[PDB]
C-alpha cells in the first residue's frame, strides 16, 4: 500500500479530542496518512483511506442509531494499513475542478463534511468539498 502524509482544508482540521475532529481557522493541524486501497476506480475518483500520522486511528463510517456516522477508530498497526481495507474505512476520493470529495463506500452519497461555522466537528451526511495540502 502507498501512503502520503497530507492535510485538508475547507472551501483547517484539528484533533479536538481523543477520537474527534473539528474544523476551524488558523498551526496545530491534523496530519493524515492517506493510503490508496482496493475498490472501484473510474474518472477522477480513487479509493482512499484516511489515518492519522503516527496514530493508529482511521476514519470510518458506521450506523449509529440507524444513520451512517463518521468516527475515528482504533486499529492494530501490524494489520494496518492494508490494500483490502474494510468498506467502513473506504473513502471514494473525488476530484472535480480544483476540489476534493470523500464518499463513504459503505454508504454512497454520504460524505466527509464540515460546518460553515468555526470549531464544529467533522461529520458524515454544509461543506462537502475540500482542499489537500501534500507535505514532506
Amino acid at each position: 500500500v502507498r501512503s502520503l502524509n497530507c492535510t485538508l482544508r475547507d472551501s483547517s482540521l484539528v484533533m479536538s479530542g481523543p477520537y474527534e475532529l473539528k474544523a476551524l481557522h488558523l498551526e496545530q493541524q491534523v496530519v493524515f496518512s492517506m493510503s490508496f486501497v482496493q475498490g472501484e476506480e473510474s474518472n477522477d475518483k480513487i479509493p482512499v483511506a484516511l489515518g492519522l500520522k503516527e496514530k493508529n486511528l482511521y476514519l470510518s463510517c458506521v450506523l449509529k442509531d440507524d444513520k451512517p456516522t463518521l468516527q475515528l477508530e482504533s486499529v492494530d498497526p501490524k494489520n494496518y494499513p492494508k490494500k483490502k481495507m474494510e468498506k467502513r474505512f473506504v473513502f471514494n476520493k473525488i476530484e472535480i475542478n480544483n476540489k476534493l470529495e470523500f464518499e463513504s463506500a459503505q454508504f454512497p452519497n454520504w460524505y466527509i463534511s464540515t460546518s460553515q461555522a468555526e470549531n464544529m466537528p467533522v461529520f458524515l451526511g454544509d461543506i462537502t468539498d475540500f482542499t489537500m495540502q501534500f507535505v514532506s
Epitope: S16, G17, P18, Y19, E20, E54, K55, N56, L57, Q71, L72, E73, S74, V75, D76, P77, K78
Partner: antibody, heavy 118, light 108 residues
Framework: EVQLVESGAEVKKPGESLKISCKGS????????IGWVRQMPGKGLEWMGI????????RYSPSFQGQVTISADKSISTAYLQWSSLKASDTAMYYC???????????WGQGTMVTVSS | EIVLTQSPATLSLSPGERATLSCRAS??????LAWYQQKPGQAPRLLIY???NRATGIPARFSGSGSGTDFTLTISSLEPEDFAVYYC?????????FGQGTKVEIKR
C-alpha cells in the same frame, strides 16, 4: 481476555519520588488512549490525565498539570504515572482505564493504593 | 466549564424496588454520557455508554436515558449486588469529568 494490570500497593514517605505502572494485554496498547483516575479515601473519581501510547500524546487535567507526569513504554505495553515529591494528600487509590471512541472508559485496572506517611 | 451533578447522594431503596438515579450537566452536552458502577472493594466498571447503551455483559435490568442536561440511570428491580456506588461521566474536548456519585443503599 482484554486486560489492564497495575502494579502493587505503595507505602511511601513524603518527599519521595514514585512511579506506578499500568500494563495492557489482549489488545493493541498503541491504538487506545489510557487515562489515570484518582480516588481519595471515601471520595469520588477524579480524572488526572490521558495518554495515547502510540505517540505518547499527553493531556492533563488543569488541576493536575505540573503535579504529575504520565508516560508510556510501547515496547512493554505500559503506561505510567509519577510524582517527584509525594505529599500525604496524594494518599489515594489510582486507577488506569482505557478510553474508547464510543466515549467511555471500557476497561479498568484493578487499582493501586498509594499511602504517603512518615 | 462543565460540571456533572448527581442526585441524590444516597438513594435508600428496598431490594426489588425500581431505582432512578439522576445526573445533571451544568450546560447542555451531547448524549455521550457514561455511567459506571463501583462495588465496594472494587474497581469501577462501565455500565452504560452514550446515555442509553448497555455495555457488554451488563444485565438487562440496567437502562439509561436522557439528553441535553438531564440524564438518568434506571435499574428496573434492584438485586443485592446492585447496591453500590454509581458515577456518571462525560468529556468535552480534552476535559473529562465525573459526577460526585450516588450510593444506592438498602432501605429496611
Amino acid at each position: 481476555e482484554v486486560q489492564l494490570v497495575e502494579s502493587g500497593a505503595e507505602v511511601k514517605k513524603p518527599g519521595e519520588s514514585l512511579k506506578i505502572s499500568c500494563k495492557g494485554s489482549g489488545y493493541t496498547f498503541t491504538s487506545y488512549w489510557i487515562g489515570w483516575v484518582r480516588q481519595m479515601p471515601g471520595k469520588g473519581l477524579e480524572w488526572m490525565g490521558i495518554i495515547y501510547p502510540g505517540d505518547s500524546d499527553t493531556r492533563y487535567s488543569p488541576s493536575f498539570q505540573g503535579q504529575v507526569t504520565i508516560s508510556a513504554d510501547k515496547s512493554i505495553s505500559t503506561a505510567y504515572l509519577q510524582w517527584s515529591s509525594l505529599k500525604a494528600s496524594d494518599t489515594a487509590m489510582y486507577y488506569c482505564a482505557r478510553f474508547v471512541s464510543l466515549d467511555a472508559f471500557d476497561i479498568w485496572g484493578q487499582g493501586t493504593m498509594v499511602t504517603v506517611s512518615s | 466549564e462543565i460540571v456533572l451533578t448527581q442526585s441524590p447522594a444516597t438513594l435508600s431503596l428496598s431490594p426489588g424496588e425500581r431505582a432512578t438515579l439522576s445526573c445533571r450537566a451544568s450546560q447542555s452536552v451531547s448524549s455521550y454520557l457514561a455511567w459506571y458502577q463501583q462495588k465496594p472493594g472494587q474497581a469501577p466498571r462501565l455500565l452504560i455508554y452514550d446515555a442509553s447503551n448497555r455495555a457488554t455483559g451488563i444485565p438487562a435490568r440496567f437502562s439509561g436515558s436522557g439528553s441535553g442536561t438531564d440524564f438518568t440511570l434506571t435499574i428496573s428491580s434492584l438485586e443485592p449486588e446492585d447496591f453500590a456506588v454509581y458515577y456518571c461521566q462525560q468529556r468535552s474536548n480534552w476535559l473529562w469529568t465525573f459526577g460526585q456519585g450516588t450510593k444506592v443503599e438498602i432501605k429496611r
